[PDB]
Structure formats: structure tokens, C-alpha cells
Paper text:
The FfIBP from Flavobacterium frigoris PS1 exhibits high TH activity and relatively strong recrystallization inhibition activity. The FfIBP structure is composed of parallel β-strands in a helical pattern, which is mainly stabilized by inner hydrophobic interactions and intramolecular hydrogen bonds with long α415. Additionally, the FfIBP has a capping head region that consists of two small turns and β-strands, which contain a disulfide bond. This disulfide bond increases the overall rigidity of the protein and reduces residual movement at the ice-binding site, thereby augmenting TH activity and protein stability.
Based on the CD and MD simulation data, four mutants annotated as FfIBP_CC1 (A101C-A120C), FfIBP_CC2 (S96C-L132C), FfIBP_CC3 (M249C-N270C), and FfIBP_CC4 (G160C-S176C), possibly forming disulfide bonds, were generated. The formation of the disulfide bond at FfIBP_CC3 is anticipated to increase the stability of the global structure as the hyperactive IBPs contain disulfide bond(s) for the intra-interaction inside of the body domain. Therefore, we generated the FfIBP_CC3, which was located in the internal body domain. To confirm the disulfide formation, we solved the crystal structures of the FfIBP_CC1, CC2, CC3, and CC4 at 2.0, 2.1, 2.0, and 2.0 Å, respectively. The failure to form a disulfide bond may be due to dihedral angle constraints and the inappropriate distance between the two cysteines. FfIBP_CC3 exhibited a ΔTm of − 0.8 °C compared to the wildtype, which is consistent with the hypothesis that the body region is heat-insensitive.
Numbering used by the authors: 61 to 276
The structure:
């Protein structure tokens, strides 16, 4: 059975990036947000958008920000370890499933690999027990189209799902995502996209009136 990706301190964040967090007001974030090593000024969230703590490396950032460089250093470090752990898993259960387009699929537990961009143009289901683990390894971009919903079935939980992407993630407007995103690059959410899962970007997270909730 497939081991969890250990996020270490990064587990405490709904959104963690390296070059900031942009926003089209109003978004709804539940969980802590942070960015390092970029200045807190690069977090463009207001205080009324975040239920949780906004962490900054410095004296800049939103009014409510807490300055904690040392915690953000560990979190981003942990996020990179998680990214490398997820990317490094061997012996996939699936390689190039749906030739890189997986709309309408029900995904069962295990390790999936794509040597391409992964596209999700229509609704999918992720189906398994409360303790089953999914790791999706994507060597290109990850695209989910407008209005596309990931459904969890069988007791599958968002905290047991990891999406590792070598390229940028693009969540289409009104889309509903489930799981942790470990992006080597950006995570770009469009108007009124929901994410039940963490957005861990080694560049930036961009929001457009999005809802982000840390998985429970």
C-alpha cells in the first residue's frame, strides 16, 4: 500500500508559495497562508479573505501578517522535500492513463505517472477507502477545465491525495479540485474555482475569487 507524502511543516498551510500569492477580491481561504523567500508584500490577500494566519518573512505584507522567517524557511524546505518525495516514487500502477486526458474516469488507489501534460476536461471520481492514497506524477502541466468537479467516493479523503506537477497547474473557473498540489511552478485558479487541498507552489499561487480549504 502506497505511503503518504509527508508535508512536514507545509501541512499547516492551505497556500504556501515561493514568489507570492495574487488574488482577485474576494477569495475565501480556510487555513494558514505563507510565502518565502519573497517579501510578504508579494502576498496580495486581505485579512478578511483568510481564516487562519498570514505568514511573512519580513515586516511587509497584509495588516494581520505574522513575521516568521524561520517557520516559512522550514515550511518551504518541507514543501520541497515533499515535492522530491512525490516525484521520486518508483513502480507506477499506471503510466499515461487516458493518453493524458482523463475526463469521466473513476481513479482507484495507487501511483499514477504522466510523461505529458495531464488534462481533466470533464468530471472524474477518486474512489477508495478513508485510508487509501493517490499520488499523481505529472511531468508537464496539469489542466482542469471550467466547471469540472473531482468527486471523492468510498471514503477517499482529500488529505490522502497528492498531485505532483513539473509544470504549472491551471484550475478552470468554477472548477472543484480535491487533494494536495505540489507544483514545481505555479498554481493558477480562475474565477470561483474551489480547492479542497493545499496549494504548494515553488513559484506563485494566483487566485480569482477562489475558495481554498485545508483538508480535514
Amino acid at each position: 500500500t502506497l505511503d503518504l507524502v509527508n508535508l512536514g511543516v507545509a501541512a499547516n498551510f492551505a497556500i504556501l508559495s515561493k514568489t507570492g500569492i495574487t488574488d482577485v477580491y474576494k477569495s475565501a481561504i480556510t487555513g494558514d497562508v505563507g510565502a518565502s523567500p519573497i517579501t510578504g508584500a508579494a502576498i496580495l490577500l486581505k485579512c478578511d479573505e483568510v481564516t487562519g494566519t498570514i505568514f511573512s518573512v519580513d515586516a511587509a505584507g497584509p495588516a494581520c501578517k505574522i513575521t516568521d522567517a524561520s517557520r516559512l524557511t522550514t515550511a518551504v524546505g518541507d514543501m520541497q522535500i515533499a515535492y522530491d518525495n512525490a516525484a521520486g516514487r518508483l513502480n507506477p500502477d499506471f503510466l499515461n492513463l487516458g493518453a493524458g486526458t482523463i475526463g469521466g474516469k473513476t481513479l482507484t488507489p495507487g501511483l499514477y505517472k504522466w510523461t505529458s501534460t495531464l488534462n481533466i476536461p470533464t468530471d472524474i471520481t477518486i474512489s477508495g477507502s478513508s485510508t487509501d492514497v493517490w499520488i499523481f506524477q505529472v511531468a508537464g502541466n496539469l489542466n482542469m477545465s471550467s466547471a469540472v468537479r473531482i468527486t471523492l467516493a468510498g471514503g477517499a479523503q482529500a488529505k490522502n491525495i497528492f498531485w505532483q506537477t513539473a509544470g504549472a497547474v491551471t484550475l478552470g473557473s468554477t472548477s472543484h479540485f480535491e487533494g494536495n498540489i505540489l507544483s514545481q511552478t505555479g498554481i493558477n485558479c480562475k474565477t470561483a474555482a474551489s480547492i479542497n487541498g493545499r496549494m504548494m507552489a515553488q513559484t506563485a499561487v494566483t487566485l480569482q475569487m477562489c475558495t481554498v480549504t485545508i483538508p480535514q
